[PDB]
Amino acid sequence: DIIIATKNGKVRGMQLTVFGGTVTAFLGIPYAQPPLGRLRFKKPQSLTKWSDIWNATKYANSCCQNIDQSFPGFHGSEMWNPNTDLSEDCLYLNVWIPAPKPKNATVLIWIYGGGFQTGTSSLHVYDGKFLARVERVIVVSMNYRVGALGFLALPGNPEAPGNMGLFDQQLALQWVQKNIAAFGGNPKSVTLFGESAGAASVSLHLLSPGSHSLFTRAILQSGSFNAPWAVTSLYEARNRTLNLAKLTGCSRENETEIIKCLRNKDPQEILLNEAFVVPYGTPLSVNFGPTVDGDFLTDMPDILLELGQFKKTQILVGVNKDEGTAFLVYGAPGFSKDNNSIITRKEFQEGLKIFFPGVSEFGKESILFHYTDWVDDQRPENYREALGDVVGDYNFICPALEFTKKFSEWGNNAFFYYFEHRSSKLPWPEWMGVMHGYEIEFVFGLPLERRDQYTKAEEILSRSIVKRWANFAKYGNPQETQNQSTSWPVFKSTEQKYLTLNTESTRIMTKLRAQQCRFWTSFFPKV
Numbered sequence: 001d002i003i004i005a006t007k008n009g010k011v012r013g014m015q016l017t018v019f020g021g022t023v024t025a026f027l028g029i030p031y032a033q034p035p036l037g038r039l040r041f042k043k044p045q046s047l048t049k050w051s052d053i054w055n056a057t058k059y060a061n062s063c064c065q066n067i068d069q070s071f072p073g074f075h076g077s078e079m080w081n082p083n084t085d086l087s088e089d090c091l092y093l094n095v096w097i098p099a100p101k102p103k104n105a106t107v108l109i110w111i112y113g114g115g116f117q118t119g120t121s122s123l124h125v126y127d128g129k130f131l132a133r134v135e136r137v138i139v140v141s142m143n144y145r146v147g148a149l150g151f152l153a154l155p156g157n158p159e160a161p162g163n164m165g166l167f168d169q170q171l172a173l174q175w176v177q178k179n180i181a182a183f184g185g186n187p188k189s190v191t192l193f194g195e196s197a198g199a200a201s202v203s204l205h206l207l208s209p210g211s212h213s214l215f216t217r218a219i220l221q222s223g224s225f226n227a228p229w230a231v232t233s234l235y236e237a238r239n240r241t242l243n244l245a246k247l248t249g250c251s252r253e254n255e256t257e258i259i260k261c262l263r264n265k266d267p268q269e270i271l272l273n274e275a276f277v278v279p280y281g282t283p284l285s286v287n288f289g290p291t292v293d294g295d296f297l298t299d300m301p302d303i304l305l306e307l308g309q310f311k312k313t314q315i316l317v318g319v320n321k322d323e324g325t326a327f328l329v330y331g332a333p334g335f336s337k338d339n340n341s342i343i344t345r346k347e348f349q350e351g352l353k354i355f356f357p358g359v360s361e362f363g364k365e366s367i368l369f370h371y372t373d374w375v376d377d378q379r380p381e382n383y384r385e386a387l388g389d390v391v392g393d394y395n396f397i398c399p400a401l402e403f404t405k406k407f408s409e410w411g412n413n414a415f416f417y418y419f420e421h422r423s424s425k426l427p428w429p430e431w432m433g434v435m436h437g438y439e440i441e442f443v444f445g446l447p448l449e450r451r452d453q454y455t456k457a458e459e460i461l462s463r464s465i466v467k468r469w470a471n472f473a474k475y476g477n478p479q480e481t482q483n484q485s486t487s488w489p490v491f492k493s494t495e496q497k498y499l500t501l502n503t504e505s506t507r508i509m510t511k512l513r514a515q516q517c518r519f520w521t522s523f524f525p526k527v
């Protein structure tokens with residue numbers, strides 16, 4: 001038996017058998033007063049100490065959220081839905097520590113994605129035991145409030161200031177600082193890493209002064225705050241809030257009176273209305289997300305980035321080959337996970353109307369013109385592939401490249417990756433390629449388990465990525481130094497070198513999506 005004394009009370013863990021060794025796991029440690037009753041929509045509050053032994057032996061509740069439902073019984077979408085009860089009582093975190101207790105281990109903290117509306121840390125693909133076992137790092141992950149209960153904003157009004165989920169994350173970073181030593185971790189070697197909306201969270205911690213001292217380094221997988229979906233303007237945050245207050249019968253004049261009305265509604269009353277606070281959405285709609293609150297974010301983050309106002313440290317940044325395709329089956333016409341989704345030129349034009357609803361007719365012709373310079377005119381997948389690339393280049397790749405250029409221009413080492421391996425167990429059809437979210441299982445080392453029917457090539461690749469990520473955490477340099485690997489060069493503005501990850505041959509390339517990204521980053525803003 002292992003029991004650890006944390007600054008708030010004793011916690012009891014459990015021991016897991018991994019790869020013929022042992023990992024000690026502490027699942028569901030509370031790290032904040034439960035945000036219930038009058039605490040709804042507030043920043044997380046400090047935890048009251050307990051005298052007993054807390055039995056952190058099962059994953060805790062996941063924060064309230066809407067469950068994905070487009071494909072009932074389909075593992076491709078259900079692997080992402082929560083696997084514990086939904087409750088507002090959900091501010092818990094998990095800790096995996098090597099066996100035996102390490103002396104001064106580097107800590108990796110995971111922040112999951114889910115478009116700031118969904119997510120939970122108990123997903124199978126976020127299991128930190130393999131990293132603990134294989135690399136002797138400590139893995140920490142936390143749950144944070146999502147959707148309206150996590151990001152509803154009437155800015156200035158402390159009854160609902162916005163960024164609550166971000167502050168949840170922050171409080172858990174504070175917990176690791178205050179307690180990870182007791183578990184044998186080094187609070188001075190802490191690396192945030194997250195994917196998608198989690199990677200945008202990580203990026204906002206680089207800007208938040210409150211977070212500057214809570215971590216060492218940062219890994220952004222398929223996400224950054226400069227992505228078009230990542231920050232809600234204060235105008236939209238208030239229209240979205242008033243709309244939700246109308247939809248629930250909570251419109252009052254005194255803005256503080258609205259919040260107490262919203263606090264009396266049931267979580268499902270709010271959750272059911274979240275979809276309609278936007279009149280016309282897109283599949284990338286983030287109805288309740290980060291805002292410039294003047295607390296976590298002291299100014300519009302793009303100004304902070306451009307004027308070097310962020311934590312100076314190393315970053316690891318990267319994207320997947322086919323980021324956009326996932327969104328194509330959540331709304332684009334003629335697309336389906338059950339057929340090859342060959343679409344015509346007309347269907348592609350309505351696809352753009354879906355993803356760019358408020359963009360001029362001239363804007364849409366420019367996208368079309370930029371993305372229909374056929375290598376082979378006769379290829380009938382042409383429009384299908386072009387539409388996924390539009391959505392992927394615009395929503396993930398180009399913003400991550402622009403983030404890495406601007407960040408590295410202030411002198412810190414940056415490393416960029418292009419993940420282009422399609423998991424042999426990927427349940428979505430082949431036309432969807434190397435989708436959003438399906439490098440995570442490689443980062444967490446799931447293919448290291450030989451019983452899981454990943455290929456041998458996948459064991460090698462995951463083993464190399466795990467070593468690169470751990471080396472980045474431990475030493476701020478993502479090399480694999482022992483197995484004649486390709487050396488991973490720094491991303492410099494005036495060359496823009498990146499590393500491709502795959503099974504066949506890891507190579508160095510330059511200026512990824514150069515022409516696409518000039519279009520989206522420089523020209524398209526003018527339309």
Ligand SMILES: *[C@@H]1O[C@H](CO[C@@H]2O[C@@H](C)[C@@H](O)[C@@H](O)[C@@H]2O)[C@@H](O[C@@H]2O[C@H](CO)[C@@H](O)[C@H](O)[C@H]2NC(C)=O)[C@H](O)[C@H]1NC(C)=O
Binds near residue numbers: 216
């Ligand atoms: C655990 O290790 C720290 C040092 O961690 C390293 O330095 C960090 C800045 C960061 O770069 C990490 O990735 C590194 O692994 C020890 O901290 C030192 O403690 C002495 C004690 O007198 C103090 O004088 C130093 O200023 C501290 N900082 C450094 C940088 O040396 C810490 O003592 C170690 N603790 C245990 C229990 O092993």
Ligand SMILES: *[C@@H]1O[C@H](CO[C@@H]2O[C@@H](C)[C@@H](O)[C@@H](O)[C@@H]2O)[C@@H](O[C@@H]2O[C@H](CO)[C@@H](O)[C@H](O)[C@H]2NC(C)=O)[C@H](O)[C@H]1NC(C)=O
Binds near residue numbers: 243
């Ligand atoms: C700001 O919000 C208003 C109100 O939104 C409407 O009411 C909400 C409760 C919710 O049900 C939304 O989906 C509604 O659309 C928006 O004004 C509406 O815009 C639509 C556009 O199709 C129009 O048909 C309605 O008549 C408008 N209703 C009112 C009362 O003005 C407005 O567009 C939002 N501003 C944005 C999104 O920039």
Ligand SMILES: *[C@@H]1O[C@H](CO[C@@H]2O[C@@H](C)[C@@H](O)[C@@H](O)[C@@H]2O)[C@@H](O[C@@H]2O[C@H](CO)[C@@H](O)[C@H](O)[C@H]2NC(C)=O)[C@H](O)[C@H]1NC(C)=O
Binds near residue numbers: 334336341
């Ligand atoms: C690919 O499928 C889409 C979606 O159709 C659904 O899935 C199919 C596998 C099959 O089960 C259909 O019966 C389902 O409706 C097809 O697009 C639909 O086309 C019909 C008729 O043209 C139209 O009424 C629907 O609104 C369309 N729905 C969507 C989401 O586009 C598409 O034609 C199929 N493409 C190919 C190449 O087979």
Ligand SMILES: O=C(CC(c1ccccc1)c1ccccc1)NC[C@@H](O)CNCC1CCCCC1
Binds near residue numbers: 114284285330
């Ligand atoms: O995952 C989200 C939000 C997210 C997104 C939405 C639809 C399709 C794909 C991803 C997102 C929205 C906006 C900006 C970035 C990411 N919601 C809960 C729910 O739908 C689950 N997701 C869908 C799957 C589809 C394949 C892999 C990714 C996850």
Ligand SMILES: *[C@@H]1O[C@H](CO)[C@@H](O)[C@H](O)[C@H]1NC(C)=O
Binds near residue numbers: 012052053
């Ligand atoms: C914690 O778990 C141990 C072992 O299963 C059990 O004996 C003990 O009663 C539990 N304590 C509490 C407070 O649940």
Ligand SMILES: *[C@@H]1O[C@H](CO)[C@@H](O)[C@H](O)[C@H]1NC(C)=O
Binds near residue numbers: 254255256257
């Ligand atoms: C709104 O309510 C709060 C709390 O009751 C009060 O302090 C504030 O003065 C009220 N504002 C207005 C404009 O009535």
Ligand SMILES: *[C@@H]1O[C@H](CO)[C@@H](O)[C@H](O)[C@H]1NC(C)=O
Binds near residue numbers: 460
């Ligand atoms: C390097 O290669 C050996 C076998 O040749 C393998 O067992 C080991 O896990 C590899 N390490 C990494 C980090 O790829």
Ligand SMILES: [Cl-]
Binds near residue numbers: 345377
């Ligand atoms: Cl054509």
Ligand code: NA
Binds near residue numbers: 509
């Ligand atoms: Na390429």
